[PDB]
Amino acid sequence: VDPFTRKEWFDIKAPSTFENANVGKTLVNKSTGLKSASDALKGRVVEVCLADLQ
């Protein structure tokens, strides 16, 4: 089937109270008639050293 044709990406920002806002990306997963995707992977964390932020 493939398990990366469907896989929409994303961008990670960060408080402004920091430097390079810019962290990298993530992978998530689209939907149907009725049902949703964005919420379907939000709440979740990302953890990057102090460093690529200050």
- For RNA, the binding residues (CB under 7 A) are 26, 43-47
Cβ closer to RNA: 34 or 46? Answer: 46
To RNA, the closest distance from the beta carbon of 41 in angstroms equals: 9
Q: CA angle, 36 as apex, 44 and 23 as ends, to 5°?
A: 35
Q: How far apart are CA 18 and CA 54, in angstroms?
A: 6
Of 21 and 41, the one with the shorter C-beta distance to RNA is: 41
As a whole number of angstroms, the distance between CA 8 and CA 37 comes to: 10
Q: How far is the CB of 53 from RNA (least distance, A)?
A: 17
